Amino acid sequence: MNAIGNFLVGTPVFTIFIALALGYLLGKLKIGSFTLGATVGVLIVALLIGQLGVFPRDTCLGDIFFDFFMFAIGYRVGPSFISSMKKFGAKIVYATLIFLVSAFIVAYAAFKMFHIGPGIAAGIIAGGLTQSAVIGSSLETISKLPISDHLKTLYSNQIPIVYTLTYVFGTIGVLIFLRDIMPKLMHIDLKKQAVKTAKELDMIPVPVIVASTHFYTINDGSSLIGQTLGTVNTKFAKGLVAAGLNDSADMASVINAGDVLAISGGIDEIGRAVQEFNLLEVTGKTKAYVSKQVVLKKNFSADVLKNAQDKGVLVATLAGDVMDPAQFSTLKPAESVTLVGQKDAVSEVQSQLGRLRAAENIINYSWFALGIALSAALGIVGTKVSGVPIALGGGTASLIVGLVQSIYRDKHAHMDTIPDSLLEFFQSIGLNLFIATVGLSAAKTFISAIQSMGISVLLIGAVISILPHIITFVIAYYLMKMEPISIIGAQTGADTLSAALNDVSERVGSDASPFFAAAVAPAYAIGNIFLTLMGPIFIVLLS
Template sequence: MWHSICNFFLTNPSVAIFLTLGLGYLLGRFHIKNFKLGATVGVLLVGLVIGQMGKFQIAPVVKNIFFDLFIFTIGYEVGPAFIASFKKKGLKFIIQSVVFTIIAFIVAFGLFKIFHVQFGEAGGIIAGALTQSACIGTANSAIEALHISQAAKTAAMSQVAIAYALTYVFGTVGVLIFLKNIAPAILHKNLREATKQYIEKNHISSSTQGLKVSANIRVRAFKLEKDCKFIGKTVADFDNSNKGIAIEEVVRNGKFLTNLTQPLENQDVILVVGDIKDFAKFADEGHALSELDANNFPVSLTEKTVLLTKEFTSQKLEKILNHGVVIDSATHDGEKISDYTRLTEGDYVKLVGMTNYLSRAIKDIGYEKAAGTKTDVSYMSIGIFLGILLGAIVITIHTIPLTLGGGGGALFAGLYFGWLQQKHPNIGVIPPSTRWLLKSLGLNLFIGVVGLEAGSGFVQALKEMGWLVFVIGILVSILPHLLTLLFSKFVLKMNIVDNIGSLCGSGTITAALNAVNAETDSTVFALSYTPTYALGNIFLTVMAPLVVALLV
């Protein structure tokens, strides 16, 4: 019976893959306080268990396709923030992220050489100890490019998966405890009190500082009488000749006009939005209008994300806000801000207001970013294609072959295509829901296949690795964070909030960010986490294939 079940799974690997995903995602929901096992570890562990049934034969192209989708999407998402982080104002964060990566590389490579760690184990330790799951894929890509036998490649890839599983838990929990509890003690600081002082010093709040927003916005309805001077004029003419008020809708013969470029006619009803004081001035001028009950003419609100262009000025934005438009959120240099006076060309602002007025007004400050519900598959596919070509390039230095591999190439292509899409929002749209699916399913299907293929040799490999891999993983997890913490404190003169927040990003450990946020009841750490997280995703992902190449 058991033999028949195993044989069925081995001859139908797609069944095993989807069972691994289903059970792995369920296992990944397990959590204790701030530590959550996560889908990736859950899928890997389930894959290793199901892999005990025998040696699964799964075409390598399956892993490659899904990993390329995942890694391209990662690059696409962090690309704009990665490029923005190189601006001068974030120089300390850039230096810290680079220093963290260099220290991590030196510590890891030194330990690997001292203890004669094999290159497959090394790739897995980096992926697990530094909690960068993408390293599994880039390490495997580097192994595939090596001039060794297929059996040796398979064994090395199994070592990657097993070493990752052994080191990931401490890489998450150990670093979380270090950054939340031990790091503040080393710096002799109370984290909660230091966070409060940081917020007060930097005047961080949720107000729209510097921009005057009127709270006295009203919508009024008027009927044009035969002597009204606006008859024959357009909506644009009305808006330009009346400061502080604008037409939102025109009702003709009981129906809303769909084309607001038509001239106004006698007996048209206009719905006007504006400030009370501007309405008072408008009424004093006398325009042969009769007022109606505006409640009989419902108007709709809309939300638009606007890319600010060189036409933008704070005065133009203030004028729009004084027509009943409010700012929902804004991003400057890739990070959310509450001080809207910092907005400049190239930033994004999400506005909520009357549909027709907002559509007309945003042309004065920029243009709408296409929200998009459909994925530009052509844009994405061409990006991955170019990335794979880039990854195929091999540079030999002193007999050491260095290559990004297909995964590394797709990552850098994603960086560029993500940055390009931000500059031209109406092309290359990949909606958030699609990006989540590509990242989650892309990575975890790849990980599931890795687990299934490594499962049959798991027990033997575990015996060969022993406790040494776990101990090395602890050192690779903690030492880079400790040394970078001290470097940032005494050399870069960073305060504790920026120091810990950016370390969470440099080590790409979101669990630690969530932990310090919960500890201090504040999300201010995200300000320094965001730029270094973008950098960390790139630097750590590239580190794995470099270590593999140097250890061969």
């Protein structure tokens, strides 16, 4: 099997993209009502592939794709972050500070009970709590510690192996617990509860009747013949604007036989007018009638918005449904109205109302590249506390950069934005590629550590990974009376388990995935910082 092993280690792209192809197929497997999922299928396939030969750890593609994934989450959760935090931000920050202290207490108790060594303790924490930087901080701390050189070398060798052994369960077992067992224990369905919580806020509006233009043709003998376009437009009720005879929006032309009288507004109102006047619909071939999206200026005038109907343009909300005139005063600046009608009339009320909103299909390459560059530059930033180095790291820096960038773009919508399909693809493939890389990097060491310290360390790692979640769940749900989706998001952020984000978001759906990411984000930063600090203090205490 030396040929297969040599080929797989020689070509890294082939291995990481053949573990990402079979991994998804394995994830699509459904047993009963339980689906393995893409992340668990990739972490299972990558280990088996990595058993074939030795694979060095690749920090060149995996880290960049993880940065892309974190930026995708931060950009997708941008607009709703403030609204989510105003409702549930202090509860989440009080649940992130309970999981961490509970994990500290449980780890200390187990380590004291089972006389666990310092290196094994730091490896177990780094694996079960799914924080990789713990190994580096522990290496630095054990280097500083005044111990014998042989003991320091032994601990520094023990740390990576225990981390690799425990990390396998700390990604599958914890994810299964907080994704399948947890909703059942809380007597709720993840999808249903997330949708209901998102409906409690203004996230998912009902589909609205879009207001459009129909090119009706006037037949001879109609009562509309012999009357001006302005007269007919005034005679029409709200939600029915005459956009102009033929291709002209002038208000003084008379309706002679053989002319097209384009009518804009809602479907039911247009149908009532059609039944009233016995008009015949014709699929008119004209490019002079359009719907534009206008971002209102800082001092948008109410008079022009009110009189756009008189000018011949239908004003509507961004969704597409026509809005009541009383809403005109209510809405705002920075709100995006939609102007529907003739080109000449829509290009003037827009000129007096604000500026055109950029469509979602266009991709802002400069915006995306600047976001990635600033994410890297901010992840560089760090500081040392009590001789222990900490930093924002790729995850936190990318999350913050995505948040601020999306908020700025939402505030000023005249600039283009990265499409949601692209953001979803990056969110999916970025985390899965990182999981594949780390699983391929650590499979032989995992099977080797099955033989030595195989059972005790694995079981203690499972206990330290599972028990804090249980106690924090009991405290939050039975005493702190949270909502289930907030509990799950706060725990996922506190544990710093990025693998759970993709799976829980895909089970929730795109409707409340922004709510889940918003719940995760504040917990994620505090969990990252405290878990990074968790290793060195444990090493100092135990040894």
